[PDB]
Write a protein that binds this ligand. Structure first.
Ligand code: K
Ligand code: K
Ligand code: K
Ligand code: K
Ligand code: K
Ligand code: K
Ligand code: K
Ligand code: K
Ligand code: K
Ligand code: MG
Ligand code: MG
Ligand code: MG
Ligand code: MG
Ligand code: MG
Ligand code: MG
Ligand code: MG
Ligand code: MG
Ligand code: MG
Ligand code: MG
Ligand code: MG
Ligand code: MG
Ligand code: MG
Ligand code: MG
Ligand code: MG
Ligand code: MG
Ligand code: MG
Ligand code: MG
Ligand code: MG
Ligand code: MG
Ligand code: MG
Ligand code: MG
Ligand code: MG
Ligand code: MG
Ligand code: MG
Ligand code: MG
Lengths: 110, 386
RNA sequence: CGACGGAAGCGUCGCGGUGACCGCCUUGAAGUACAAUUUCCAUCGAGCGGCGGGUAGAAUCCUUUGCAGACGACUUAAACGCGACGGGGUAUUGUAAGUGGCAGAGUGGCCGCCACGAUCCACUGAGAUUCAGCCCUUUGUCGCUCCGAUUCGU
RNA sequence: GUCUCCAAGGUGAACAGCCUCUGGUCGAUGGAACAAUGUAGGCAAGGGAAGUCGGCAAAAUGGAUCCGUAACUUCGGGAAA
RNA sequence: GUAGUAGCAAAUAUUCAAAUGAGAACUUUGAAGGCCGAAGAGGGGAAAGGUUCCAUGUGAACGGCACUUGCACAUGGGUUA
């Protein structure tokens, strides 16, 4: 519909990382988030903000958060002969006072 | 020289090869012997394995320790919604066995059955039976259809109906492609069989028309798959001593010097499970008819209002809402696997076969844990409505 | 065309149409010089150029599922349902954090107040987790509905 | 395989093991699956060496304080009996 | 031929962003998460080696995957009693 769109998602990392090897759990979370953005935005080029990477690794390589609230912003790449026209930027999102209860997908305005 | 000590061989050579079955739906290898003096009746039915539970009943077995006592026995729930007849096929007895003579189909076929004829239904143009269905629309075409039926009445010796399941009615299966099979018609003359089959075109046949309560049936299906497996698990050979170099989960000697070849009777690692099996003498404890008290888990002794499905649903299956059969013991295959029910080929005369079942209690607690509440209301009342 | 034939019927029979043979008549054969396969049949298969009629699909790869699985393979799904959240059901643990307490062995100051205190009690069978191969599902939110590729014919 | 110098904090008897600061370093080709067999590490109802040439292997015991400690003895020990 | 087969598996571990480059899982910077844990994977020296030291640059080969990399190759510099 619109190439430039931003939304906030709640990713359930617990079920995606179930039974994963400890030494690959947090690294696998990065791959799962990258895959999640590709399906939710249809853009192969996905960039993970350093703050989100910090949150993923906050509790070490084993204990990744069960659920994470992230903002995915699809935007146009404006560099000479970019491999892809668009790319998605995944960043951390604020959690309301009530937490992740009753919180679905939300579209962010301009 | 002779083996030092004698024990029976591990495993059965009557179930070889231990390969993956070339089919997913259970095939009926043999139908019951036909008795012309009896009314026309179907001999088989398709169902889906929903799950297991246990029941309690008072045994009536004179001379037994359990006489007038209560026994707890496991049972399997098989959801058996009515099947739809969509065609008829006749076979002629030849010196080379039965040969298929002709196949007559019904005018209207559901989308679920038509999916069985495609590998990608959505991408196709869905042309199946479109031209065939048109000849039902003309007088000359109708005469041809009737002529084919008369041809079966004259030459056919075995008549089977084409029936498919209404798989859409069980949303837990997540499948829209129905299962089709040939079900033999026993009883009556050949003409009656054809008239019996043609009369059911596009109509539904309930499971109660095939089976009933307290009778012995055979269950046919494909066992649970388990992939590549070693000899110890696959064949039951004993493990080697702890200090065995290069591993102990093996057969030590796979053959004498002569014959200078490995024999087919020696245990070898390979595929385990997903094998075709035909299990005999499964007693029907209960037949649940939708819209009737028989569909609920009520008994003459337990008046608690509750359904057959345990609270939380049958794990990996869902909620049973259609007709179902309660079968003593265990059934082949995983949850959701299509199973074939067949009438017994033997004459059931043993006391166990003729025993009249009377259930006292049917457990409906959650099977996803150590369930202690038979109903959701009981659980809610326990926690002050939680 | 009609009837019959189901053991592999693919044939038999009847009626009608049509050709040949036969019947009658006419005409010819050689110098192909003394033999040189007596090429010509039906069994399908056809391959082509034309003249008519007929027909207007699938499979596989990519994706998906886990009733399957070493890899292949297999069972599912692909304009409406599916997918991502969330909710409910179910289950595991055992009562969260915060607040309050005239609960607490006692102890240190001040003139009952104040400070310290493991633990205890109330809110609280609470909180957390629950398909990843659990069940139901819009009360509610959101997305996607198909760019393609490889082949296959009596 | 190859001589030697410097040597922090916590726990503790301890330059034991375990964790940390200074300094150093992520150098061991990577990716995807989670079959058999294997190697390394575990656990297990009831029985408890019936296994096996043989308790092989593993398990059990383990620190400290108090009590208590036999035969035998070269009178010292045995003894952490 | 075997055969694109046996095989690459000890020493806990990598991840994100950006820069550079024809080319980045492997170079550099920053951030995070780990390890050595002072009888060290830290800081020196004796033997032994002999330029491996430092800067810049680099077609190939070599560093048993790869490299923009370097204890490799090329040019120059460097050891004061
Ligand atoms: K022998
Ligand atoms: K068994
Ligand atoms: K054994
Ligand atoms: K609390
Ligand atoms: K409580
Ligand atoms: K293994
Ligand atoms: K023994
Ligand atoms: K030296
Ligand atoms: K001097
Ligand atoms: Mg047979
Ligand atoms: Mg399996
Ligand atoms: Mg040995
Ligand atoms: Mg269970
Ligand atoms: Mg939920
Ligand atoms: Mg699923
Ligand atoms: Mg101390
Ligand atoms: Mg120490
Ligand atoms: Mg034991
Ligand atoms: Mg025990
Ligand atoms: Mg004992
Ligand atoms: Mg013994
Ligand atoms: Mg013995
Ligand atoms: Mg030992
Ligand atoms: Mg002694
Ligand atoms: Mg190899
Ligand atoms: Mg090796
Ligand atoms: Mg590897
Ligand atoms: Mg290593
Ligand atoms: Mg590395
Ligand atoms: Mg260590
Ligand atoms: Mg450490
Ligand atoms: Mg020292
Ligand atoms: Mg190399
Ligand atoms: Mg250098
Ligand atoms: Mg050099």
């Amino acid at each position: 519909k619109e190439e430039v769109v931003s939304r906030e998602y709640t990713i359930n990392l617990h079920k995606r990382l179930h039974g994963c090897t400890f030494k690959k759990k947090a690294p696998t979370a990065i791959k799962e988030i990258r895959k999640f953005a590709q399906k939710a935005m249809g853009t192969k080029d996905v960039r993970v903000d350093v703050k989100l990477n910090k949150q993923i690794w906050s509790r070490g390589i084993r204990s990744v958060p069960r659920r994470v609230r992230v903002r995915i912003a699809r935007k146009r790449n404006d560099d000479e002969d970019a491999k892809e026209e668009l790319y998605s930027l995944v960043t951390v999102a604020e959690i309301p006072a009530e937490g992740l209860k009753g919180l679905g997908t939300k579209i962010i305005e301009d | 020289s002779h083996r030092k000590f004698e024990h029976p061989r591990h495993g059965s050579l009557g179930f070889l090869p231990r390969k993956r079955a070339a089919r997913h739906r259970g095939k009926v290898k043999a139908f019951p012997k036909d008795d012309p003096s009896k009314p026309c009746k179907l001999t088989a039915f398709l169902g889906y394995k929903a799950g297991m539970t246990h029941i309690v009943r008072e045994v009536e077995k004179p001379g037994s320790k359990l006489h007038k006592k209560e026994t707890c026995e496991a049972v399997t729930i098989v959801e058996t919604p009515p099947m739809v007849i969509v065609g008829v096929v006749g076979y002629v007895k030849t010196p080379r066995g039965l040969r298929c003579l002709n196949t007559v189909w019904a005018q209207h076929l559901s989308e679920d059955i038509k999916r069985r004829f495609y590998k990608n239904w959505c991408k196709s143009k869905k042309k199946a039976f479109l031209k065939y269905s048109k000849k039902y629309e003309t007088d000359e075409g109708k005469k041809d259809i009737q002529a084919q039926l008369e041809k079966l009445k004259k030459y056919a010796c075995v008549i089977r109906v084409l029936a498919h399941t209404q798989i859409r009615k069980m949303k837990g299966l997540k499948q829209k492609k129905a299962h089709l099979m040939e079900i033999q018609v026993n009883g009556g003359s050949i003409a009656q069989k054809v008239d019996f089959a043609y009369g059911f075109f596009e109509k539904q046949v309930p499971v109660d028309a095939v089976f009933q309560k307290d009778e012995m049936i055979d269950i046919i299906g494909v066992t649970k798959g388990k992939g590549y497996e070693g000899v110890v698990t696959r064949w039951g050979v004993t493990r080697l001593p702890r200090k065995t170099h290069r591993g102990l989960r093996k057969v030590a000697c796979i053959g004498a010097w002569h014959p200078a070849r490995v024999s087919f009777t020696v245990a070898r690692a390979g595929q385990n499970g997903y094998h075709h099996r035909t299990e005999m003498n499964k007693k029907v404890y209960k037949l649940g008819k939708v819209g009737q008290e028989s569909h609920t888990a009520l008994t003459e002794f337990d008046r608690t209002e509750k359904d057959i499905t345990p609270i939380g649903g049958f794990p990996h299956y869902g909620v049973v809402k259609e007709d179902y059969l309660l079968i003593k013991g265990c059934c082949v295959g995983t949850k959701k696997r299509v199973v074939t029910l067949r009438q017994s080929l033997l004459n059931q005369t043993s006391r166990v076969a003729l025993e009249e079942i009377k259930l006292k209690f049917i457990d409906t607690s959650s099977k996803f844990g150590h369930g202690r509440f038979q109903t959701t209301q009981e659980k809610q009342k326990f926690y002050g409505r939680l």
